[PDB]
Every structure is written in C-alpha cells, then in structure tokens.
Design an enzyme around this catalytic site. Structure first.
Site, PDB file in Angstrom:
ATOM      1  N   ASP A   9       0.843  -1.194   0.000  1.00 54.07           N
ATOM      2  CA  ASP A   9       0.000   0.000   0.000  1.00 54.07           C
ATOM      3  C   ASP A   9       0.889   1.260   0.000  1.00 54.07           C
ATOM      4  O   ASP A   9       2.058   1.210   0.378  1.00 54.07           O
ATOM      5  CB  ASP A   9      -0.929   0.004   1.231  1.00 54.07           C
ATOM      6  CG  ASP A   9      -2.129   0.944   1.069  1.00 54.07           C
ATOM      7  OD1 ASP A   9      -3.023   0.915   1.953  1.00 54.07           O
ATOM      8  OD2 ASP A   9      -2.218   1.657   0.035  1.00 54.07           O
ATOM      9  N   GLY A  10       0.319   2.398  -0.375  1.00 53.96           N
ATOM     10  CA  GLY A  10       1.075   3.653  -0.299  1.00 53.96           C
ATOM     11  C   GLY A  10       0.129   4.845  -0.328  1.00 53.96           C
ATOM     12  O   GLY A  10      -0.961   4.759  -0.888  1.00 53.96           O
ATOM     13  N   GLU A  47       1.096   4.578  -4.292  1.00 50.86           N
ATOM     14  CA  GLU A  47       0.410   3.310  -4.540  1.00 50.86           C
ATOM     15  C   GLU A  47       1.183   2.467  -5.565  1.00 50.86           C
ATOM     16  O   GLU A  47       1.282   1.257  -5.406  1.00 50.86           O
ATOM     17  CB  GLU A  47      -1.023   3.548  -5.057  1.00 50.86           C
ATOM     18  CG  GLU A  47      -1.992   3.981  -3.961  1.00 50.86           C
ATOM     19  CD  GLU A  47      -3.369   4.391  -4.482  1.00 50.86           C
ATOM     20  OE1 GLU A  47      -3.670   4.140  -5.676  1.00 50.86           O
ATOM     21  OE2 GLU A  47      -4.163   4.916  -3.664  1.00 50.86           O
ATOM     22  N   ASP A  69      -4.860  -2.753  -2.963  1.00 49.39           N
ATOM     23  CA  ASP A  69      -6.200  -2.188  -3.052  1.00 49.39           C
ATOM     24  C   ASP A  69      -6.284  -1.005  -4.002  1.00 49.39           C
ATOM     25  O   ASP A  69      -7.317  -0.317  -4.063  1.00 49.39           O
ATOM     26  CB  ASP A  69      -6.734  -1.787  -1.669  1.00 49.39           C
ATOM     27  CG  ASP A  69      -6.060  -0.533  -1.108  1.00 49.39           C
ATOM     28  OD1 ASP A  69      -6.560  -0.015  -0.073  1.00 49.39           O
ATOM     29  OD2 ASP A  69      -5.159   0.033  -1.764  1.00 49.39           O
ATOM     30  N   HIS A 123      -9.876  -2.702   3.919  1.00 50.15           N
ATOM     31  CA  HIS A 123      -8.944  -3.310   4.836  1.00 50.15           C
ATOM     32  C   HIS A 123      -9.541  -4.438   5.669  1.00 50.15           C
ATOM     33  O   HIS A 123      -8.868  -5.282   6.121  1.00 50.15           O
ATOM     34  CB  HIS A 123      -8.368  -2.274   5.725  1.00 50.15           C
ATOM     35  CG  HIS A 123      -7.297  -1.494   5.063  1.00 50.15           C
ATOM     36  ND1 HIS A 123      -6.960  -1.694   3.763  1.00 50.15           N
ATOM     37  CD2 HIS A 123      -6.519  -0.492   5.503  1.00 50.15           C
ATOM     38  CE1 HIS A 123      -5.991  -0.872   3.430  1.00 50.15           C
ATOM     39  NE2 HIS A 123      -5.687  -0.162   4.478  1.00 50.15           N
ATOM     40  N   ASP A 133      -0.672  -0.082   5.081  1.00 47.42           N
ATOM     41  CA  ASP A 133      -1.176   1.300   5.185  1.00 47.42           C
ATOM     42  C   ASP A 133      -0.538   2.000   6.403  1.00 47.42           C
ATOM     43  O   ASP A 133      -0.095   3.139   6.309  1.00 47.42           O
ATOM     44  CB  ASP A 133      -2.710   1.316   5.271  1.00 47.42           C
ATOM     45  CG  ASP A 133      -3.278   2.704   5.465  1.00 47.42           C
ATOM     46  OD1 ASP A 133      -3.009   3.601   4.627  1.00 47.42           O
ATOM     47  OD2 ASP A 133      -4.106   2.850   6.380  1.00 47.42           O
TER      48      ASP A 133
END
Length: 152
Positions: A9-10, A47, A69, A123, A133
């Site tokens: 994630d980012g 991301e 995601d 999540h 995250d």
C-alpha cells in the site's frame, strides 16, 4: 520457482505532499517488510511505487501472488498499459503518459515474474494490507527520499 506472497500500500498525508509506501514479501512463512517516505509525491505515485519496490526486491524469478487495493494500479495493469505501450507511452494528445517513469519501472518488473493479482477492496479481512497502510503513513511522517519523477 519460489512462490512469494506480496502485499502493498502507499499514500500521502496530504496529496500532493509527504508520502510513503509499505510492502510485505512473505516466503515460506517468513516476512520481509519494506517502507520508505518521500518528501513530495502523490497518492497514486506511492500506490504504484509500493508495488514497484516489492517486485524489484525479488532477486530471482518467482511465482507471485500480489495483493493491492489500488484502483490506479489495478486499472493501469488490466486496462491501460497494453495500449500505452502500443502508443509509445503517449496519450492521444501525444503527451507522455502521466507517471510514465513509474509505469515503465513497473512494466520491467512485471515481465520477470508469474504474477497473480489479487485486487483487494477494503482493509476489513485484509490485515497485511492494513499493516502496509500503517507503514506508509508512518514513513510519510519522516520522509527521507526525493520522488524525482514526480512532476506537478
């Protein structure tokens, strides 16, 4: 071939601004975590950087199950990228594709592995992505890197 599970994630604290990624590679039960913060970047770029950094970490050809995601990464991978390449990485107005530096960086990592993409929504039920995250948001609080390809 080695089989590896990847979760990524980012994101940014404010977009555009400080941002960071978190990634988790898991192989035979063991995990390695990656995380870094950037002084000025965007949500989409972090991301995508998350996925890039995780794949670049693989030092041999693997079978990879990659969970992210990100709608941006999902749509780039499943819809856009094949046609970007046909078009020399430019849109219809002949401008380079936005974030072309990161997309090309991704493209070069994708080809080296047998990847099964598991697009995640939420999540809930996905504790590794939630943990990614948290890493991202923590790295963003003390960024040390420059996101050089980022162009406002």
């Amino acid at each position: 071939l080695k089989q590896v599970e990847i979760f990524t994630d980012g994101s940014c604290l404010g977009n555009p601004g400080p941002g960071g990624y978190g990634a988790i590679l898991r192989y035979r039960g063991r995990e390695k975590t990656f995380s870094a913060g950037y002084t000025r970047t965007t949500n989409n770029r972090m991301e995508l950087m998350a996925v890039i950094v995780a794949l670049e970490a693989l030092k041999e050809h693997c079978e990879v199950i990659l969970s992210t995601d990100s709608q941006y990464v999902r749509q780039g991978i499943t819809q856009w990228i094949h046609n970007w390449k046909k078009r020399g990485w430019k849109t219809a107005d002949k401008k380079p594709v936005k974030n072309v530096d990161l997309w090309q960086r991704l493209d070069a990592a994708l080809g080296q592995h047998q990847i099964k993409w598991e697009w995640v929504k939420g999540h809930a039920g996905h504790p590794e992505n939630e943990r990614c995250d948290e890493l991202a948001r923590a790295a963003a609080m003390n960024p040390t890197l420059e996101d050089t390809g980022y162009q406002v």
